[PDB]
Symmetry: D2
């Protein structure tokens, strides 16, 4: 207790009874489980992003507005079904629903658009349909590609080549769907931006009883590499027909978050099901509960022990900022980022504190949804004449959005992460600030 006694006197016992903080303070994983409390309410914003597949049940602008409000962060377009005209209309509807909230930039929630490819089929690699669909993606400015049936590093290179010179900024998330993809995982992760554990095909390609081993291994390896990992397929399957999920489905969603997944996905549940909005709301409710149940004490210790020494100032600042956030129970870590990289490096240490990422790049704001606990804020103001004042205005924008979004209150401590000069790659500063 002496390690939390002064902070308990200052913040109160009510603060320390919420968000599974009694379980967080435990000295062993066993004691942590024993202290999990159904009466300990989650307080933090939901950190695991929700990917919802867009289809006939979730295509209308009106329905998409409800889905964004329910918690959808990434809209998935499954190119296994529908024409280019159909998907272009889905993209337009998503963009219309997203831009309907651009009224106030303080609450504007960016939504990424992901293109999920049909796949190689009987072919040994990049199909002609995938080449056409990937070209459509670049032309329509998609943020992410979920590349189907990635079996080796050369499959990812073929996807990158098909995106051409104009699609260099698009994130490639390799879908691991068969035995070869699992066995060649390391070479695939090395050349990918992230991974999707595509359990539908994986569960038919390898014995169904082995899928959890592949899922846990891939999530662990992605967490170690600091690259986003998506858990997908049949997470809330029964909700395609019923308004409430089974006990196995709620458990699966909670366990994907506890495993370390950055994102969780909905397929038939939102694309064609009877309750698309309810499915998004259910993933949101479970992820909030499960994130608070993460045993950060061991996770942070293990991420530090396993991660190699780094001479990169962004990485060095990120670990210092996460350590500082844990020391004071910081409400948030506000970070300025051009590409999303500084926010991704904070996310890899899994802080309890929300990572509020302030960026001018609309694409980076959408793409950072791939990183757990990163809350993107799109800054729209033109640059100030003095650079230091432009940095300060962006930090204040993060604070004001954080106050109005519920993340921050007067009296809270926040960690602010910035760099010494303009441009990407120069993050090197960490500040402890009292919110006024």
């Amino acid at each position: 207790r002496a390690d939390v006694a002064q902070l308990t006197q200052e913040l109160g016992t009510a603060f320390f009874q919420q968000q599974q903080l009694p379980a967080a303070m435990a000295d062993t994983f066993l004691e942590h489980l024993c202290l999990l409390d159904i009466d300990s309410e989650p307080v933090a914003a939901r950190s695991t992003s929700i990917i919802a597949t867009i289809g006939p049940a979730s295509r209308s602008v009106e329905r998409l507005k409800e889905m964004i409000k329910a918690g959808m962060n990434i809209a998935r377009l499954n190119f296994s079904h529908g024409s280019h005209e159909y998907h272009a209309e889905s993209i337009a509807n998503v963009r219309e629903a997203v831009e309907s909230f651009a009224g106030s930039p303080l609450s504007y929630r960016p939504v990424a658009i992901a293109l999920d490819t049909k796949g190689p089929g009987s072919g040994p690699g990049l199909s002609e349909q995938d080449v056409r669909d990937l070209r459509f993606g670049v032309e329509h400015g998609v943020d992410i590609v979920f590349a189907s049936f990635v079996r080796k590093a050369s499959d990812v290179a073929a996807v990158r080549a098909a995106l051409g010179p104009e699609g260099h900024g698009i994130k490639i998330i390799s879908k691991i769907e068969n035995h070869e993809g699992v066995k060649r995982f390391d070479e695939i992760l090395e050349v990918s931006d992230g991974i999707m554990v595509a359990r539908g095909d994986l569960g038919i390609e390898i014995p169904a009883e082995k899928v959890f081993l592949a899922q846990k291994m891939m999530i662990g390896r992605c967490n170690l590499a600091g690259k986003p990992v998506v858990c997908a397929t049949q997470m809330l399957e029964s909700m395609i027909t019923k308004p409430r999920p089974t006990r196995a489905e709620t458990s699966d969603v909670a366990n994907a978050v506890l495993d370390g997944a950055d994102c969780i996905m909905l397929s038939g549940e939102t694309a064609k099901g009877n309750f698309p909005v309810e499915a998004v709301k259910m993933q949101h409710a479970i992820a909030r509960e499960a994130e608070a149940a993460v045993y950060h004490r061991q996770l942070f210790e293990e991420l530090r022990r396993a991660a190699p020494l780094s001479r990169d100032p962004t990485e060095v600042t990120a670990i210092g900022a996460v350590e500082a956030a844990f020391k004071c129970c910081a409400a948030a870590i506000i970070v300025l980022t051009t590409t999303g990289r500084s926010a991704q490096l904070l996310s890899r240490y899994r802080p309890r504190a929300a990572v509020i990422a302030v960026t001018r790049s609309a694409q980076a704001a959408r793409q950072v949804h791939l990183c757990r606990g990163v809350f993107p804020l799109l800054y729209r103001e033109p640059p100030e004449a003095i650079w230091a004042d432009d940095v300060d205005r962006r930090v204040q924008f993060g604070i004001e959005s954080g106050k109005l979004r519920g993340f921050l209150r007067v009296g809270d401590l926040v960690i602010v992460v910035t760099g010494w000069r303009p441009g990407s790659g120069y993050t090197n500063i960490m500040r402890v600030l009292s919110i006024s």
Copy 2:
């Protein structure tokens, strides 16, 4: 030789952190050990046939659950007769005979504040028909367990009482309930309606952790393979749920509609068996054993002291099994609480203890039928040899394997105090 350290997730077992353990999990590393998490199958119209029950026993069913929320006493007496006929059909080959427990799951208190009159009648029927376990519905406080125990009367003292936690009050009063119960059931069906659905996993993980700390059996129940009531293969969420219940530390996993009324009762049992085997090999024993040891208090009880020594010895040599002689099952339960990787082969003359020890993870009961040898030390050795011969026939043991043998210094329950390292010949 060399292939041995490739199997049963041994590369992941040797890892220095839980994160690296996860990174080393291999879909090609085949499980070798026998499946340690017991399977409880609910009996109903889909699974009452004596011939279908024989297939369920072969598939891996260890405990037959009788749900007294449906059917009369006449119905449940027929279910018991059918289970006993199917189980006893294998008694002609003692080396492969698998005991099967019979559990009575009560209707519950309804709108009442405690033990119902129907529950009193059902509990007496349970004693009269010799059931091994009671799964007491809606246990909300310690007095509910005392009322169940009193309704079982003087003749039902040996029946195990597994308290079902199904509502907010049961979760909040968990410690006082566990203290007076033989074990717990995380009854997720009612729990998921009584508390928010998104909070059930917290209740399940807490209860399993607390039962593991207390060394008392814990059952994970309801909708684990729900889609298998009508489909031949489960969903990805269902296989994950079964695997995670085992990784959480559940001693038993259960099937309800999947075996009582569904079209795939045998396949549901086979699926739980296949998943549990994979998940048990994926347990990070290095941390689990260390934490169970650190949390367990010092003990002056020789059975408890021998059990921790035997489990430590089994991990040191990668023992294929710990062979234990037991009258009540207690010596096997105390070995099970330290979660050894080695199968705990429990040799007993008590048909009831043989059935009840299925509640304890990794305990493989063998019912010894022979009358005692005149020389007690020779009778103990004959039982150890029966454990070895059964283990060999069932694939648990081979010549060259090391086994830990746990026995006592005198006849009768409560005197376990010896651990021996034996090479299988």
Copy 3:
């Protein structure tokens, strides 16, 4: 080559046992010596010429034992120490501050702070001593009497309570609470309690001081045989190494420097052993345990300190440069025992002297002209830390350093940590 030195193979070990197995006599220490050396000034070490050699050998704190000698004698010792210290002031990038500590005679027959101690404490204030080593502290009220005897002009003097008997050990927690630090005074402790129990008292007190983040001094008979012999015994080198491994902030020399035949050699020996022992510290366990035990805090200096030490370990930072007025920001970094040297840039001459009490804090006294813009003044003090660090061998071009500063002037506002590449 980098990873072969300063016991880095042993530092990477997964257990304390494997760390011991990987210790290498060929792995040379590269970091500057972090444990301060306290040398007792007496007939063998009073000359200005001798004191210059002692400062060069590694003496950081000059102890005046008021159990012997008059006020006139000690005033002359103080003047000689100050003359020797100030003779190196011509090179500001290499100047080493040296603290002056007054070790009291003690209560004797007990009851009441001695009238001799009242006079000696007033002498200390008048002569501007940095530290008081208060003899035979048995309870919190003894520290209060020492503080009261220092008066209004002595508020800034650090009180290091000497634990010398059973009562002091038993009432340790209440003593530490009101003291700036502790001295494990093994001479009297070894006569007051059984000789074979002193190591238990030493290890307990060092552990509790490390937990509290307060300085702890190991003292007496560390290199005893060096009073008459040019080389110490095997037990003496082991004792010095083990005091550093136990977690002592300072190590002391008494008769070895006050009256011995080899005072300079004794200082050189403590310096050589301490540097080897500091590299042999198993930081992986020490940092984790200190981090887990240090309470959660909303004080920005405490929050910045742990973030800075974590960042330093992540990049193998050559140093943590910190700006400090009172020494507090450097003390809060020192409590986490970084491998990186804590270079404390200060304008206060007294704070520069007193921070030698905290392990791994290298004080630099800032004497460069002031800048008109506060932001430029801070930057120049940071560049001074870099320049002094380069000259002294702490830093080289290409090294990474962690820089710790505040958002406004004055003490108590440290809240910034920056990762900086040298040149």
Copy 4:
């Protein structure tokens, strides 16, 4: 059932701590040691400690191993020292409470230069075999071939003599692994080591060698200048008491006295001081981390003696066992228990007088020489030896009725079959 007082003695509050830092913070000068002293004391025999009367006082003070330094004195001088040690030891053979085996160790002059074993070392090693010494402390061992030369010189009759390799220079430290592999144990010979390598590096060599020996399960001796000032002064310095305590905390199986007992004015007081400090330091060992690390670092084993030893040590910790009674012919089963550093005393019952003397090299092993004729029924002979261990334990203060003990035996007679651990209640 143990009482409250039980958990306050032998640093049990510090033993229960969750971190090493918390363990240090909980060390208590008022928490009295209760266990018997486990670190053996080696005393060098010389003019100050040669008389039968002085040796009797040294045995009473705690001397377990008598060291004969063949760097000085003739074969006739050392034969008289050996006879005096044996006379002093056998003078207690009447009283079971006072009789204790004492090993005799021959410390060689060394190679000086040359390319192999010196002619003097060959003759001195032959003298050792002829006079039935238990241990050889081989001076200036630099490589594995130096150990093989000592092993060869122990002739056809002395293959059972333990070779403790003395590491005294840079080459010995650098070639440590190959030396330890072929040796029975190691001596950290700090006198020469402190002249051969920089004085400030000796502690690194000491801690490294003790750690590697602990990992290998082989005895390690800390030697030279431990209580140096006691050659002329009746009490040691603060650095000397610290050095003894830290050698025990480092993991040394034995501690040594050289000039302190060979020529000093206070030989008996030096032995008493080492006994007093070792008892305090053994209780201060952080067993929770030590056992966990020894467990994690030691490889998996299919040797039943090793498997039984770890099970027995785990069981001893679980019940706070007063002792682990082990039957051993060569000492190996006691050595394998000792490597896991139990807090419980390891009472080793043996018929071998040589094994009884030699097991003093292993920390926490209390040898009991058994001389009853063998029973016709082997199980009866085993039971009689187990009860001999219990009754000796009761007489010596290790055990009382109601205590729990762990008993380690094998399934058949002869060395190499240890495979049984039992939990017994003392009646």
